[PDB]
């Protein structure tokens, strides 16, 4: 499901992140050798962590927000979020006619736009495959005409099967709440819910 925000529900401008913390969580078997060399082995999967802080929420906005959150807690599905700082539409066009040749594993990826896309995805922008819900981060870009060579920080979780389509816009993190067990909201005498915050965490 979709986390409410001013893009989906413009009538509630109180929704919307006062501050978002996009943390990098890659567990590693780090070992500090006696000779000064540091050896680290990556085994556990990496996952983005999102910490959302909300401004002063009025009672109706908080009613909508916690209604959506409680529906999340009820039906048990995943909770998608859209970070707005990465919503710079730097790539126009429709990506259905873009083919990613099969048999690709690792950070590097090669995709052929077939002369369809307009706009260059600069480093630091997000990237997501059509099938898998993992969200990557472009670290370097290099194109030779139509073919694009993109390097992603997390290695491709699944090897491309030749049908996965690039998603350069409207990327949603498939996250799970981490504050659900004890989630309280305080109501002031001024009439606003203060200090509403979420500690999300990408699942899979």
């Amino acid at each position: 499901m979709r986390l409410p925000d001013p893009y989906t529900n413009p009538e509630y401008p109180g929704l919307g992140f006062e501050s978002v913390n996009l943390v990098d969580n890659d567990p590693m078997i780090r070992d500090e050798l006696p000779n000064g060399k540091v050896k680290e082995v990556k085994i556990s999967a990496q996952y983005w962590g999102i910490n959302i802080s909300y401004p002063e929420l009025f009672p109706d906005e908080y009613a909508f927000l916690d209604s959506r959150l409680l529906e999340y807690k009820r039906t048990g599905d995943y909770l998608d979020v859209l970070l707005p700082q990465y919503e710079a539409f730097r790539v126009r066009g429709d990506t259905k006619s873009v083919t990613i040749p099969a048999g690709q594993k690792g950070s590097q990826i090669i995709l052929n736009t077939n002369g369809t896309l307009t706009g260059q995805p600069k480093a630091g922008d997000l990237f997501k495959l059509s099938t898998h819900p993992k969200v990557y981060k472009i670290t370097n870009f290099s194109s030779s005409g139509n073919v694009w060579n993109i390097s992603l920080y997390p290695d491709l979780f699944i090897t491309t099967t030749g049908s996965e389509k690039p998603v350069f816009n409207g990327i949603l993190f498939r996250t799970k709440l981490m504050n659900g067990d004890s989630f309280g909201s305080t109501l002031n005498n001024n009439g606003t819910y203060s200090g509403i915050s979420l500690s999300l965490r990408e699942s899979l």
Binding site: P27, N35, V41, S44
Partner: protein, 317 residues
């Protein structure tokens, strides 16, 4: 008192900051016994050359404490390798490889101002020995944390020659054990399992299985299948009580259900021991003349002082 060179007795007394390195030399676990490869390692930050051997660094992480009491016990030591080398991991986790009797020697080296090894041991004019024994055990501990830093530790286990305290090394009076018989294709052929290569054509214990039954014909109804205990008194310690200790002591054991009574004892000094029959047969035309062979003791003995035919020695008191 392990004597130390007087030259080292001055350095160990004047200098306060001592730079010490432990030089490890373990034998590689190999599938077969052919050859003898050694991995040389050190705990120091730089490689250390000792007797022309380069003890490479960057693998060993920690070493345990060697403790020795005045009661006989296995001397256990535990040194840990990094476990992320991925070249030491495969040696430990390799399939079809055994390290049952692979040794390890650890030296305690002190570094000088110029970076050399301060001589300590008088006989070698080099560093002391911290531990030398056998590799009995091992393991790796992977700990992958879903958020944070994981660790992996490969720990090698070490001990002295007495690691297997439940080990009975003895020459049981039997042909199959004496010559190390093993089926090779379709026959029981002697192998290298014998304690000596010259034991492969020794048929001394060939008729030991039927000796007791044949001998029993010429004995009393009692003592038909019996033998005196080789050791009567064994030692009263805190592991026993007076009643239990003096009740456990036995005089004679039945040979039809006591396979521990057919082991060959070893005697130092003048002691009385029973004889285990290994052959018994009569003459053809004189059936009342019976030859019976008793195996007394083990190894090159000085000789037999006296023989007790029954309970009366041939040489009277």
């Amino acid at each position: 008192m392990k004597k130390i060179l007087d030259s080292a007795k001055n350095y160990l007394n004047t200098h306060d900051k001592l730079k010490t390195a432990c030089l490890i030399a373990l034998e590689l676990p190999s599938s077969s016994g052919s050859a003898a490869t050694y991995i040389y390692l050190t705990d120091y930050f730089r490689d250390v050359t000792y007797n022309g051997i380069l003890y490479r660094s960057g693998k060993v992480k920690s070493i345990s404490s060697h403790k020795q009491n005045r009661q006989l016990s296995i001397g256990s030591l535990s040194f840990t390798i990094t476990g992320t080398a991925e070249d030491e991991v495969l040696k430990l986790v390799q399939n079809g490889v055994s390290f049952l009797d692979r040794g390890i020697t650890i030296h305690q080296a002190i570094i000088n101002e110029e970076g050399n090894i301060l001589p300590v041991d008088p006989d070698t004019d080099g560093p002391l020995l911290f531990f030398r024994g056998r590799i009995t055990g091992g393991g790796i501990k992977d700990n992958v944390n879903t958020s944070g830093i994981g660790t992996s530790v490969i720990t090698w286990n070490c001990s002295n020659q007495f690691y297997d305290f439940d080990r009975v090394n003895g020459r049981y009076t039997d042909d199959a054990s004496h010559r190390g018989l093993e089926v090779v294709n379709g026959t029981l052929q002697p192998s290298n399992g014998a304690k000596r290569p010259e034991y492969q054509e020794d048929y001394g214990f060939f008729h030991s299985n039927k000796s007791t039954t044949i001998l029993a014909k010429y004995q009393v109804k009692e003592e038909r299948y019996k033998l005196q205990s080789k050791k009567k008194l064994f030692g009263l310690s805190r592991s026993y009580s007076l009643k239990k200790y003096y009740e456990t002591v036995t005089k004679e054991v039945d040979l039809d259900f006591n396979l521990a009574a057919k082991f060959i004892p070893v005697v130092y000094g003048v002691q009385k021991i029973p004889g285990i029959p290994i052959f018994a047969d009569t003459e053809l035309n004189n059936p009342n003349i019976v030859y019976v062979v008793y195996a007394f003791a083990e190894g090159e003995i000085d000789g037999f002082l006296d023989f007790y035919i029954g309970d009366s020695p041939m040489i009277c008191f």
